[PDB]
Write a protein that binds this ligand. Structure first.
Ligand SMILES: *[C@@H](CC(=O)O)[C@H](CCC(N)=O)NC(=O)[C@H](CC(C)C)NC(=O)[C@H](CCC(N)=O)NC(=O)[C@H](Cc1ccccc1)NC(=O)[C@H](CCC(=O)O)NC(C)=O
Ligand SMILES: *[C@@H](CC(=O)O)[C@H](CCC(N)=O)NC(=O)[C@H](CC(C)C)NC(=O)[C@H](CCC(N)=O)NC(=O)[C@H](Cc1ccccc1)NC(=O)[C@H](CCC(=O)O)NC(C)=O
Lengths: 177, 180
């Protein structure tokens, strides 16, 4: 059911944490939008923290979903899965061994995130073994005990290596877009 | 993966099969329909069957999939190769599951002798489940990888551990039976 939460959004994707909470990477958000999912901006509580943006709606947009745990990154060494959905209809889950949470500057943008190494390896070639432009917003998830946890959204990666970066939520964040 | 590559993955018996070329179809022996009189409209007497354990190749005498080019089929791949298992599910989902291949070996699975290659799924910490790993119904799915500018198929899905993190694809062998 995890895949059902990954939604196409703007130039990337977003993830439904619950019926009222949607997270995504700031960069991919549709520009000058008057509303989202039929809901007027004034009825949405937007939390924009750098490259991590969270939308909290007044009503249930995805009432078919249960509420998941959202945390600010994960312990270093955790092996997560980045749930990459493609317009081709392909669902591409990729294991990533997470590194440290750190402030970063990626192509002119300040990114509070966590780097990770794709298990497909540095020698891995092909879009089916790594992330590519258009994949931002994809969720980084993992299971702790009996609970599923989402700890970030895809923000960047090296062009020829196996290093990726997911933006992570922060306490401070703007209220507008 | 390219749309034409996915188009080669075909529902077959209790699983799937893969069109290597317009005249060659491969699958896992276990999923082959029982008591079949023909395949794709061709009577058995017109098909050259090569059944090598859990790997079966069908060669037809007319182009069944003329829209396709011929691909390279090899007996497994080098240990360490990262392949993608082209999994199709009944609801239209396409899941190219990454797998780091291990060694080729003669295995004994549920009493069956399976000449195959094991591999570690690279989808998550525990590929247990339908969203991250393989499940019953997926046998026959091709294990492929790109070498330079050529897509190569090196096996067909045959098994997985209970946790689901380790998988096995049946691989072709030079010797095989000519019957079902
Ligand atoms: C999603 C948004 C979009 O499509 O615009 C997209 C996903 C890219 C991917 N390949 O998964 N993100 C980007 O494109 C992002 C910009 C947005 C606005 C945040 N840029 C990157 O991810 C670029 C690669 C773009 C591309 N053509 O694929 N990556 C970097 O700049 C990378 C950042 C990084 C990655 C891992 C760890 C730390 C930092 N930096 C490098 O590749 C550097 C560049 C040279 C340098 O300054 O050192 N090179 C090396 C070897 O690290
Ligand atoms: C496709 C055909 C079908 O649907 O019947 C299907 C795909 C399974 C999947 N989940 O991807 N294949 C099978 O079901 C296949 C049929 C055999 C080849 C006749 N069997 C298995 O995949 C079983 C499923 C066990 C289960 N989940 O209950 N897997 C094994 O038997 C597994 C094979 C293996 C894989 C990797 C490395 C080594 C061995 N073996 C085990 O789990 C063994 C069994 C020991 C025993 O039989 O007593 N146990 C351990 C701990 O390794």
């Amino acid at each position: 059911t995890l895949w059902s939460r990954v939604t196409k959004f703007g130039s990337g994707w977003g993830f439904w944490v619950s019926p009222t909470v949607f997270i995504t990477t700031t960069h991919v958000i549709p520009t000058s939008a008057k509303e989202f999912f039929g809901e007027p901006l004034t009825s949405i509580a937007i939390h924009r923290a750098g490259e991590f943006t969270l939308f909290r709606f007044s009503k249930k947009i995805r009432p078919d979903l249960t509420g998941m745990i959202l945390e600010e990154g994960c312990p270093e060494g955790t092996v997560c899965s980045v749930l990459i959905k493609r317009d081709s209809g392909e669902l591409l889950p990729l294991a990533v061994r997470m590194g440290a949470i750190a402030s970063m500057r990626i192509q002119g943008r300040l990114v509070h995130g966590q780097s990770g190494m794709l298990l497909t390896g540095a020698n891995a070639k092909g879009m089916d073994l790594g992330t590519i432009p258009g994949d931002c917003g994809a969720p980084y998830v993992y299971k702790r005990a009996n609970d599923w946890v989402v700890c970030g959204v895809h923000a960047a990666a090296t062009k020829s290596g196996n290093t990726v970066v997911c933006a992570v939520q922060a306490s401070e964040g703007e209220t507008t877009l």
